[PDB]
Amino acid sequence: PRLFECSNKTGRFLATEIVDFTQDDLDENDVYLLDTWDQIFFWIGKGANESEKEAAAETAQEYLRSHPGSRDLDTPIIVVKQGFEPPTFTGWFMAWDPLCWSDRKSY
User: Fold this and answer.
1) Strand duo 40-44 + 31-35: pairing
2) What is the CATH code of the structural domain delimited by 1-107?
3) Residue of 35, 37, 33, 61 lying closest to 45 (CA atoms)
4) Which of 1, 45, 70, 80 could form a disulfide with 29 if both were Cys (CB 3.0 to 4.6 A apart)?
């Protein structure tokens, strides 16, 4: 439910948590972490450094430890690339998306 913007300034990576916000505050290219019930959605843009995605990935696991379940952490994460916004992920937000009918258009 809560995001996590972690990016490096110049040569050092910085980890910062971001309260459940909307896409409006969603920076252009940054490393965010959206932990949902089914699984955590890892959104990685094009600008996001290779290290940021790595550090921000492990830093998030720390929070997951607070969640229930036993080996729920073993579950794999759905990697996301820059330029793809599925109507499923958006549902994880508090503000519904009009693109939720992307499937209704078909059988």
Assistant:
1) antiparallel
2) 3.40.20.10
3) 33
4) 45
Half-sphere exposure of 86 (CA within 13 A, CB side): 10
* 84's tokens: 């793809």
Q: How many CB atoms lie under 10 A from the CB of residue 19? A: 8
| Residues contacting residue 82 through CB under 8 Å, at least 6 positions apart | 29, 44, 45, 46, 47
**Measured distance CA(89)–CA(104) in Å, rounded:** 17
- Give the whole-angstrom CA distance, residue 106 versus residue 40: 27
Q: Is 34 within 8 Å of 92 (Cβ atoms)?
A: yes
Q: How many CB atoms lie within 10 A of CB 88?
A: 16
